[PDB]
Amino acid sequence: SCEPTRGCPTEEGCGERFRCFSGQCISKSLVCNGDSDCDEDSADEDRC
Amino acid sequence: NSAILTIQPKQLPGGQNPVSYVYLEVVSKHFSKSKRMPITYDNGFLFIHTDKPVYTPDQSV
C-alpha cells in the first residue's frame, strides 16, 4: 500500500461520437448501420 | 468550486488581426483537458443616452 501524490487518471468518453458499453467511441453514422460496429457489445444495434 | 478568470485584455498577442479562439484548461491531480472555447471582444455593455431622441440643425448632440 502507498498514499500517492499521483492522481488516478480519469477516463473519458465520446462527445459528438457515439459510445459503446466498453467506452470505445464510434461514429454516429454507424448507429443502426446493422453491422456490429461496436466490437463486442453492439450498442449501435440496440432497440432500432 | 469556482475560479474567476479572464483573458487579460492587453495580454492577447493581438495586432492587425484578433485571436478568435482560446483554450480553457484544467490541471487537476487526476485530469486535464483543454477545449477550444471562443472569446469575444464584446465585453460588458455600452448604453448611450442622448439629451433628446431628436434634434434640429444648429444644435449639438
- β-sheet bridge partners, residue B24: none
CB-count exposure of residue B7 (10 Å: 0-12, 13-18, 19+): middle
Determine the distance in angstroms separating the CA of A25 from the nearest CA of chain B, rounded to an integer: 18
Resolution, Å (one decimal): 3.5
Cα–Cα nearest to A22, from A11, A35, A10:
A11
Determine the distance in angstroms separating the CA of B35 from the nearest CA of chain A, rounded to an integer: 12
Indicate left, alpha or beta for A47 from its phi (over 0: left) and psi (-120 to 50: alpha).
Answer: left
Interface probe with A: pick from B26, B31, B32, B36, most Cβ of A within 10 Å: B31
Is residue B32 within a helix (H) or strand (E), and if so which, with residue range? strand B32-33
- DSSP E strand boundaries for A1-48: 18-19, 25-26
Residue B8 corresponds to which cell in the numbers above? 487579460
Helix, strand, coil shares of chain B as percentages rounded to 5? 5, 15, 80
Cα–Cα nearest to A23, from A33, A34, A14, A10:
A14
Residue B52 corresponds to which cell in the numbers above? 433628446
Instruction: Indicate yes or no: CB of A7 within 8 angstroms of CB of B30.
Output: yes
Relative to beta strand B36-38, strand B21-23 is antiparallel
